[PDB]
mmCIF file of all heavy atoms in Angstrom:
data_model
loop_
_atom_site.group_PDB
_atom_site.id
_atom_site.type_symbol
_atom_site.label_atom_id
_atom_site.label_comp_id
_atom_site.label_asym_id
_atom_site.label_seq_id
_atom_site.Cartn_x
_atom_site.Cartn_y
_atom_site.Cartn_z
ATOM 1 N N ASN A 1 -45.056 -53.281 -61.071
ATOM 2 C CA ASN A 1 -44.555 -54.541 -60.583
ATOM 3 C C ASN A 1 -43.024 -54.410 -60.543
ATOM 4 O O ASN A 1 -42.232 -54.149 -61.595
ATOM 5 C CB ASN A 1 -44.715 -55.648 -61.622
ATOM 6 C CG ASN A 1 -44.263 -56.883 -61.200
ATOM 7 O OD1 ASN A 1 -43.318 -57.066 -60.515
ATOM 8 N ND2 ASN A 1 -45.016 -58.051 -61.743
ATOM 9 N N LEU A 2 -42.536 -54.416 -59.296
ATOM 10 C CA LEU A 2 -41.058 -54.204 -59.163
ATOM 11 C C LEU A 2 -40.366 -55.490 -58.820
ATOM 12 O O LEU A 2 -39.342 -55.446 -58.160
ATOM 13 C CB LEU A 2 -40.719 -53.056 -58.226
ATOM 14 C CG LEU A 2 -41.007 -51.529 -58.757
ATOM 15 C CD1 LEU A 2 -40.582 -50.574 -57.684
ATOM 16 C CD2 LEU A 2 -40.030 -51.330 -60.062
ATOM 17 N N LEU A 3 -40.892 -56.610 -59.143
ATOM 18 C CA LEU A 3 -40.123 -57.820 -59.234
ATOM 19 C C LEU A 3 -39.841 -58.058 -60.496
ATOM 20 O O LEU A 3 -38.621 -58.592 -60.895
ATOM 21 C CB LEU A 3 -40.913 -58.991 -58.594
ATOM 22 C CG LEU A 3 -40.382 -59.745 -57.436
ATOM 23 C CD1 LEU A 3 -39.721 -58.919 -56.421
ATOM 24 C CD2 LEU A 3 -41.499 -60.554 -56.774
ATOM 25 N N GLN A 4 -40.682 -57.793 -61.549
ATOM 26 C CA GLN A 4 -40.401 -58.120 -62.938
ATOM 27 C C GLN A 4 -39.325 -57.194 -63.512
ATOM 28 O O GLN A 4 -38.375 -57.718 -64.175
ATOM 29 C CB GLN A 4 -41.807 -57.872 -63.727
ATOM 30 C CG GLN A 4 -42.664 -59.006 -63.567
ATOM 31 C CD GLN A 4 -43.905 -58.738 -64.390
ATOM 32 O OE1 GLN A 4 -44.363 -57.566 -64.561
ATOM 33 N NE2 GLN A 4 -44.747 -59.761 -64.605
ATOM 34 N N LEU A 5 -39.233 -55.985 -63.070
ATOM 35 C CA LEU A 5 -38.337 -55.137 -63.627
ATOM 36 C C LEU A 5 -36.884 -55.560 -63.388
ATOM 37 O O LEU A 5 -36.021 -55.648 -64.289
ATOM 38 C CB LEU A 5 -38.605 -53.702 -63.127
ATOM 39 C CG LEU A 5 -37.487 -52.632 -63.558
ATOM 40 C CD1 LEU A 5 -37.459 -52.455 -65.170
ATOM 41 C CD2 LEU A 5 -37.597 -51.287 -62.807
ATOM 42 N N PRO A 6 -36.435 -55.611 -62.095
ATOM 43 C CA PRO A 6 -35.128 -56.092 -61.793
ATOM 44 C C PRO A 6 -34.793 -57.446 -62.526
ATOM 45 O O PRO A 6 -33.687 -57.532 -62.944
ATOM 46 C CB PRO A 6 -35.085 -56.291 -60.201
ATOM 47 C CG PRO A 6 -36.152 -55.336 -59.784
ATOM 48 C CD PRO A 6 -37.221 -55.386 -60.844
ATOM 49 N N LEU A 7 -35.715 -58.263 -62.690
ATOM 50 C CA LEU A 7 -35.430 -59.498 -63.315
ATOM 51 C C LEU A 7 -35.151 -59.397 -64.963
ATOM 52 O O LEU A 7 -34.314 -60.056 -65.534
ATOM 53 C CB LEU A 7 -36.529 -60.737 -63.141
ATOM 54 C CG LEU A 7 -36.702 -61.286 -61.644
ATOM 55 C CD1 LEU A 7 -37.907 -61.942 -61.563
ATOM 56 C CD2 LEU A 7 -35.518 -62.141 -61.362
ATOM 57 N N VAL A 8 -35.874 -58.569 -65.489
ATOM 58 C CA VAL A 8 -35.576 -58.113 -66.919
ATOM 59 C C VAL A 8 -34.282 -57.302 -67.191
ATOM 60 O O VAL A 8 -33.571 -57.555 -68.084
ATOM 61 C CB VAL A 8 -36.712 -57.405 -67.627
ATOM 62 C CG1 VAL A 8 -36.394 -56.944 -69.076
ATOM 63 C CG2 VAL A 8 -38.084 -58.169 -67.460
ATOM 64 N N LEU A 9 -33.999 -56.683 -66.111
ATOM 65 C CA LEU A 9 -32.715 -55.929 -66.083
ATOM 66 C C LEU A 9 -31.516 -56.883 -65.921
ATOM 67 O O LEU A 9 -30.523 -56.814 -66.688
ATOM 68 C CB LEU A 9 -32.624 -54.886 -64.950
ATOM 69 C CG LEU A 9 -33.546 -53.687 -65.214
ATOM 70 C CD1 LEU A 9 -33.526 -52.772 -64.118
ATOM 71 C CD2 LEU A 9 -33.147 -52.984 -66.462
ATOM 72 N N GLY A 10 -31.634 -57.923 -65.013
ATOM 73 C CA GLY A 10 -30.706 -58.949 -64.810
ATOM 74 C C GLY A 10 -30.587 -59.773 -66.103
ATOM 75 O O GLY A 10 -29.417 -59.972 -66.565
ATOM 76 N N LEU A 11 -31.678 -60.167 -66.637
ATOM 77 C CA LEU A 11 -31.588 -60.787 -68.023
ATOM 78 C C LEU A 11 -30.743 -60.005 -68.969
ATOM 79 O O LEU A 11 -29.750 -60.577 -69.545
ATOM 80 C CB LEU A 11 -33.045 -61.078 -68.514
ATOM 81 C CG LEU A 11 -32.991 -61.771 -69.921
ATOM 82 C CD1 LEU A 11 -32.346 -63.194 -69.808
ATOM 83 C CD2 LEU A 11 -34.374 -61.888 -70.483
ATOM 84 N N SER A 12 -31.080 -58.773 -69.214
ATOM 85 C CA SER A 12 -30.210 -57.946 -70.062
ATOM 86 C C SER A 12 -28.724 -58.071 -69.699
ATOM 87 O O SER A 12 -27.912 -58.006 -70.729
ATOM 88 C CB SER A 12 -30.799 -56.488 -69.987
ATOM 89 O OG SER A 12 -32.242 -56.488 -70.046
ATOM 90 N N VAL A 13 -28.379 -57.865 -68.375
ATOM 91 C CA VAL A 13 -27.000 -57.794 -68.052
ATOM 92 C C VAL A 13 -26.341 -59.115 -68.569
ATOM 93 O O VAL A 13 -25.279 -59.109 -69.189
ATOM 94 C CB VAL A 13 -26.656 -57.469 -66.598
ATOM 95 C CG1 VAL A 13 -25.291 -57.595 -66.330
ATOM 96 C CG2 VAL A 13 -27.143 -56.145 -66.242
ATOM 97 N N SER A 14 -27.090 -60.265 -68.341
ATOM 98 C CA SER A 14 -26.529 -61.490 -68.624
ATOM 99 C C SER A 14 -26.358 -61.770 -70.086
ATOM 100 O O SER A 14 -25.306 -62.401 -70.524
ATOM 101 C CB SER A 14 -27.247 -62.697 -67.948
ATOM 102 O OG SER A 14 -28.565 -62.791 -68.486
ATOM 103 N N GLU A 15 -27.223 -61.318 -70.908
ATOM 104 C CA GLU A 15 -27.186 -61.462 -72.408
ATOM 105 C C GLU A 15 -25.985 -60.646 -72.802
ATOM 106 O O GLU A 15 -25.235 -61.189 -73.599
ATOM 107 C CB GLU A 15 -28.597 -60.891 -72.967
ATOM 108 C CG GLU A 15 -29.704 -61.776 -72.795
ATOM 109 C CD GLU A 15 -31.078 -61.162 -73.110
ATOM 110 O OE1 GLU A 15 -31.176 -59.867 -72.972
ATOM 111 O OE2 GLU A 15 -32.043 -61.980 -73.166
ATOM 112 N N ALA A 16 -25.840 -59.415 -72.248
ATOM 113 C CA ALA A 16 -24.706 -58.545 -72.707
ATOM 114 C C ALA A 16 -23.459 -59.233 -72.361
ATOM 115 O O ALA A 16 -22.470 -59.134 -73.158
ATOM 116 C CB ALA A 16 -24.904 -57.165 -72.065
ATOM 117 N N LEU A 17 -23.070 -59.658 -71.188
ATOM 118 C CA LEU A 17 -21.930 -60.178 -70.754
ATOM 119 C C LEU A 17 -21.416 -61.405 -71.552
ATOM 120 O O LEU A 17 -20.212 -61.760 -71.710
ATOM 121 C CB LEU A 17 -21.901 -60.480 -69.218
ATOM 122 C CG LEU A 17 -22.192 -59.373 -68.279
ATOM 123 C CD1 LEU A 17 -22.358 -60.008 -66.804
ATOM 124 C CD2 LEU A 17 -21.076 -58.244 -68.279
ATOM 125 N N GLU A 18 -22.508 -62.161 -71.917
ATOM 126 C CA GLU A 18 -22.186 -63.311 -72.810
ATOM 127 C C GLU A 18 -21.939 -63.032 -74.261
ATOM 128 O O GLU A 18 -21.082 -63.576 -74.880
ATOM 129 C CB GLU A 18 -23.483 -64.334 -72.626
ATOM 130 C CG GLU A 18 -23.241 -65.487 -73.684
ATOM 131 C CD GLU A 18 -24.019 -66.728 -73.411
ATOM 132 O OE1 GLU A 18 -24.924 -66.656 -72.545
ATOM 133 O OE2 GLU A 18 -23.774 -67.758 -73.994
ATOM 134 N N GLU A 19 -22.617 -62.046 -74.753
ATOM 135 C CA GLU A 19 -22.333 -61.624 -76.087
ATOM 136 C C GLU A 19 -20.805 -61.199 -76.100
ATOM 137 O O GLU A 19 -20.129 -61.442 -77.059
ATOM 138 C CB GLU A 19 -23.287 -60.360 -76.444
ATOM 139 C CG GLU A 19 -24.561 -60.824 -76.697
ATOM 140 C CD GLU A 19 -25.459 -59.850 -77.525
ATOM 141 O OE1 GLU A 19 -24.868 -58.778 -77.932
ATOM 142 O OE2 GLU A 19 -26.744 -60.087 -77.526
ATOM 143 N N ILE A 20 -20.476 -60.563 -75.008
ATOM 144 C CA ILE A 20 -19.045 -59.957 -75.026
ATOM 145 C C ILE A 20 -17.993 -60.975 -74.693
ATOM 146 O O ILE A 20 -16.894 -60.893 -75.274
ATOM 147 C CB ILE A 20 -18.974 -58.874 -73.979
ATOM 148 C CG1 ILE A 20 -19.748 -57.514 -74.450
ATOM 149 C CG2 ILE A 20 -17.369 -58.596 -73.662
ATOM 150 C CD1 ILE A 20 -19.519 -56.494 -73.468
ATOM 151 N N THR A 21 -18.239 -61.990 -73.816
ATOM 152 C CA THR A 21 -17.196 -62.858 -73.317
ATOM 153 C C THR A 21 -17.431 -64.311 -73.737
ATOM 154 O O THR A 21 -16.607 -65.077 -73.766
ATOM 155 C CB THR A 21 -17.297 -62.808 -71.705
ATOM 156 O OG1 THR A 21 -18.444 -63.512 -71.209
ATOM 157 C CG2 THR A 21 -17.243 -61.357 -71.158
ATOM 158 N N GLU A 22 -18.659 -64.494 -74.211
ATOM 159 C CA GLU A 22 -19.028 -65.846 -74.593
ATOM 160 C C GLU A 22 -19.353 -66.791 -73.459
ATOM 161 O O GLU A 22 -19.754 -67.940 -73.694
ATOM 162 C CB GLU A 22 -17.901 -66.556 -75.449
ATOM 163 C CG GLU A 22 -17.726 -65.881 -76.739
ATOM 164 C CD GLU A 22 -16.720 -66.553 -77.624
ATOM 165 O OE1 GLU A 22 -15.615 -66.842 -77.322
ATOM 166 O OE2 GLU A 22 -17.202 -67.035 -78.783
ATOM 167 N N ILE A 23 -19.121 -66.382 -72.251
ATOM 168 C CA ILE A 23 -19.516 -67.056 -70.969
ATOM 169 C C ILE A 23 -21.011 -66.782 -70.670
ATOM 170 O O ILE A 23 -21.470 -65.780 -70.783
ATOM 171 C CB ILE A 23 -18.666 -66.533 -69.814
ATOM 172 C CG1 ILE A 23 -17.192 -66.596 -69.987
ATOM 173 C CG2 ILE A 23 -19.234 -67.240 -68.515
ATOM 174 C CD1 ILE A 23 -16.696 -67.971 -70.531
ATOM 175 N N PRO A 24 -21.699 -67.922 -70.353
ATOM 176 C CA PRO A 24 -23.108 -67.807 -70.100
ATOM 177 C C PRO A 24 -23.247 -67.526 -68.468
ATOM 178 O O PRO A 24 -22.330 -67.869 -67.658
ATOM 179 C CB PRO A 24 -23.713 -69.127 -70.322
ATOM 180 C CG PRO A 24 -22.498 -70.179 -70.456
ATOM 181 C CD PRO A 24 -21.233 -69.351 -70.318
ATOM 182 N N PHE A 25 -24.220 -66.808 -68.031
ATOM 183 C CA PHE A 25 -24.426 -66.358 -66.734
ATOM 184 C C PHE A 25 -25.811 -66.723 -66.207
ATOM 185 O O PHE A 25 -26.745 -66.891 -66.966
ATOM 186 C CB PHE A 25 -24.186 -64.852 -66.790
ATOM 187 C CG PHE A 25 -22.786 -64.468 -66.830
ATOM 188 C CD1 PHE A 25 -22.267 -64.098 -68.250
ATOM 189 C CD2 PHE A 25 -21.908 -64.309 -65.771
ATOM 190 C CE1 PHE A 25 -20.987 -63.641 -68.374
ATOM 191 C CE2 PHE A 25 -20.591 -63.870 -66.082
ATOM 192 C CZ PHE A 25 -20.145 -63.607 -67.249
ATOM 193 N N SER A 26 -25.886 -66.711 -64.974
ATOM 194 C CA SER A 26 -27.137 -67.127 -64.302
ATOM 195 C C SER A 26 -27.817 -65.960 -63.648
ATOM 196 O O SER A 26 -27.101 -64.777 -63.461
ATOM 197 C CB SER A 26 -26.907 -68.177 -63.170
ATOM 198 O OG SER A 26 -26.443 -69.335 -63.812
ATOM 199 N N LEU A 27 -29.070 -66.038 -63.382
ATOM 200 C CA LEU A 27 -29.751 -64.955 -62.695
ATOM 201 C C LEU A 27 -30.167 -65.443 -61.374
ATOM 202 O O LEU A 27 -30.655 -66.616 -61.224
ATOM 203 C CB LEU A 27 -31.085 -64.598 -63.566
ATOM 204 C CG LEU A 27 -30.969 -64.213 -65.005
ATOM 205 C CD1 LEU A 27 -32.268 -63.719 -65.518
ATOM 206 C CD2 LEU A 27 -29.906 -63.049 -65.040
ATOM 207 N N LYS A 28 -29.996 -64.632 -60.273
ATOM 208 C CA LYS A 28 -30.446 -64.996 -58.964
ATOM 209 C C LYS A 28 -31.751 -64.267 -58.656
ATOM 210 O O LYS A 28 -31.944 -63.072 -58.984
ATOM 211 C CB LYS A 28 -29.429 -64.557 -57.860
ATOM 212 C CG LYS A 28 -29.860 -64.965 -56.450
ATOM 213 C CD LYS A 28 -28.646 -64.902 -55.519
ATOM 214 C CE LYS A 28 -28.915 -65.503 -54.036
ATOM 215 N NZ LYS A 28 -27.882 -66.337 -53.602
ATOM 216 N N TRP A 29 -32.891 -65.066 -58.257
ATOM 217 C CA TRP A 29 -34.056 -64.471 -57.953
ATOM 218 C C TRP A 29 -33.708 -63.897 -56.522
ATOM 219 O O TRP A 29 -33.121 -64.524 -55.639
ATOM 220 C CB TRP A 29 -35.162 -65.450 -57.936
ATOM 221 C CG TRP A 29 -36.308 -64.877 -57.714
ATOM 222 C CD1 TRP A 29 -37.208 -64.261 -58.701
ATOM 223 C CD2 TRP A 29 -36.858 -64.531 -56.467
ATOM 224 N NE1 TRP A 29 -38.241 -63.740 -57.894
ATOM 225 C CE2 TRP A 29 -38.086 -63.958 -56.643
ATOM 226 C CE3 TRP A 29 -36.548 -64.867 -55.108
ATOM 227 C CZ2 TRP A 29 -38.986 -63.544 -55.565
ATOM 228 C CZ3 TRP A 29 -37.468 -64.459 -54.113
ATOM 229 C CH2 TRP A 29 -38.557 -63.732 -54.376
ATOM 230 N N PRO A 30 -34.143 -62.577 -56.201
ATOM 231 C CA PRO A 30 -34.819 -61.750 -57.271
ATOM 232 C C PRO A 30 -33.911 -60.728 -58.062
ATOM 233 O O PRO A 30 -34.399 -60.067 -58.843
ATOM 234 C CB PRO A 30 -35.705 -60.956 -56.276
ATOM 235 C CG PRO A 30 -35.012 -60.746 -55.045
ATOM 236 C CD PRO A 30 -34.200 -62.181 -54.944
ATOM 237 N N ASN A 31 -32.564 -60.477 -57.836
ATOM 238 C CA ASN A 31 -32.008 -59.549 -58.630
ATOM 239 C C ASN A 31 -30.536 -59.514 -59.133
ATOM 240 O O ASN A 31 -30.150 -58.488 -59.753
ATOM 241 C CB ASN A 31 -32.259 -58.039 -57.984
ATOM 242 C CG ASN A 31 -32.530 -58.082 -56.566
ATOM 243 O OD1 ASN A 31 -31.531 -58.372 -55.675
ATOM 244 N ND2 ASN A 31 -33.763 -57.688 -56.117
ATOM 245 N N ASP A 32 -29.697 -60.477 -58.842
ATOM 246 C CA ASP A 32 -28.304 -60.296 -59.271
ATOM 247 C C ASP A 32 -28.011 -61.187 -60.393
ATOM 248 O O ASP A 32 -28.882 -62.025 -60.786
ATOM 249 C CB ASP A 32 -27.379 -60.469 -57.935
ATOM 250 C CG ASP A 32 -27.625 -59.423 -56.970
ATOM 251 O OD1 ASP A 32 -28.070 -58.283 -57.363
ATOM 252 O OD2 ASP A 32 -27.230 -59.608 -55.804
ATOM 253 N N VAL A 33 -26.878 -60.986 -60.847
ATOM 254 C CA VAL A 33 -26.394 -61.883 -62.041
ATOM 255 C C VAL A 33 -25.116 -62.563 -61.498
ATOM 256 O O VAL A 33 -24.189 -62.079 -60.939
ATOM 257 C CB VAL A 33 -25.910 -61.114 -63.256
ATOM 258 C CG1 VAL A 33 -25.505 -61.929 -64.497
ATOM 259 C CG2 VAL A 33 -26.942 -60.149 -63.834
ATOM 260 N N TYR A 34 -25.015 -63.904 -61.827
ATOM 261 C CA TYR A 34 -23.933 -64.798 -61.175
ATOM 262 C C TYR A 34 -23.245 -65.505 -62.267
ATOM 263 O O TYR A 34 -23.752 -65.921 -63.276
ATOM 264 C CB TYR A 34 -24.770 -65.687 -60.231
ATOM 265 C CG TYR A 34 -25.016 -65.230 -58.764
ATOM 266 C CD1 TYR A 34 -25.618 -63.933 -58.722
ATOM 267 C CD2 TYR A 34 -24.626 -65.869 -57.562
ATOM 268 C CE1 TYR A 34 -25.806 -63.437 -57.460
ATOM 269 C CE2 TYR A 34 -24.723 -65.204 -56.386
ATOM 270 C CZ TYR A 34 -25.359 -64.103 -56.314
ATOM 271 O OH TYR A 34 -25.657 -63.553 -55.054
ATOM 272 N N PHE A 35 -21.943 -65.897 -61.971
ATOM 273 C CA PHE A 35 -21.382 -66.968 -62.605
ATOM 274 C C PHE A 35 -21.188 -68.021 -61.523
ATOM 275 O O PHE A 35 -20.418 -67.941 -60.637
ATOM 276 C CB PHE A 35 -20.045 -66.663 -63.265
ATOM 277 C CG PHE A 35 -19.412 -67.748 -64.027
ATOM 278 C CD1 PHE A 35 -20.043 -68.138 -65.131
ATOM 279 C CD2 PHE A 35 -18.379 -68.519 -63.623
ATOM 280 C CE1 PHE A 35 -19.625 -69.261 -65.985
ATOM 281 C CE2 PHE A 35 -17.842 -69.608 -64.427
ATOM 282 C CZ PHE A 35 -18.528 -70.015 -65.517
ATOM 283 N N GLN A 36 -22.000 -69.148 -61.712
ATOM 284 C CA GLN A 36 -21.991 -70.226 -60.645
ATOM 285 C C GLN A 36 -22.518 -69.692 -59.442
ATOM 286 O O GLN A 36 -23.504 -68.863 -59.353
ATOM 287 C CB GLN A 36 -20.604 -70.957 -60.721
ATOM 288 C CG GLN A 36 -20.495 -71.678 -61.897
ATOM 289 C CD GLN A 36 -19.168 -72.513 -62.081
ATOM 290 O OE1 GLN A 36 -18.861 -73.195 -63.097
ATOM 291 N NE2 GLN A 36 -18.269 -72.259 -61.046
ATOM 292 N N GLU A 37 -21.964 -69.919 -58.194
ATOM 293 C CA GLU A 37 -22.537 -69.332 -57.087
ATOM 294 C C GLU A 37 -21.846 -67.997 -56.705
ATOM 295 O O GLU A 37 -22.043 -67.513 -55.542
ATOM 296 C CB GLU A 37 -22.474 -70.331 -55.821
ATOM 297 C CG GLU A 37 -22.977 -71.742 -56.124
ATOM 298 C CD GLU A 37 -24.395 -72.017 -55.685
ATOM 299 O OE1 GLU A 37 -24.786 -71.428 -54.545
ATOM 300 O OE2 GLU A 37 -25.123 -72.766 -56.351
ATOM 301 N N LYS A 38 -21.293 -67.368 -57.642
ATOM 302 C CA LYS A 38 -20.604 -66.069 -57.484
ATOM 303 C C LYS A 38 -21.195 -64.869 -58.177
ATOM 304 O O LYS A 38 -21.262 -64.906 -59.439
ATOM 305 C CB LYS A 38 -19.053 -66.213 -57.614
ATOM 306 C CG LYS A 38 -18.441 -67.282 -56.888
ATOM 307 C CD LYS A 38 -17.048 -67.612 -57.426
ATOM 308 C CE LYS A 38 -16.171 -68.290 -56.339
ATOM 309 N NZ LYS A 38 -14.663 -68.241 -56.670
ATOM 310 N N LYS A 39 -21.477 -63.853 -57.499
ATOM 311 C CA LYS A 39 -22.133 -62.674 -57.940
ATOM 312 C C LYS A 39 -21.025 -61.831 -58.855
ATOM 313 O O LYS A 39 -19.926 -61.587 -58.426
ATOM 314 C CB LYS A 39 -22.430 -61.711 -56.864
ATOM 315 C CG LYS A 39 -22.988 -60.459 -57.194
ATOM 316 C CD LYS A 39 -23.702 -59.824 -56.048
ATOM 317 C CE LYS A 39 -24.532 -58.458 -56.239
ATOM 318 N NZ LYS A 39 -25.312 -58.027 -55.055
#
């Protein structure tokens, strides 16, 4: 399943960037990580 994979990867990136910066981040379906409407 290659829709699930990129989404869990994106989740991971967003968890990491928030741990580091304290800023929360969004996930764009199907694959990128965003702050607001910006990749």
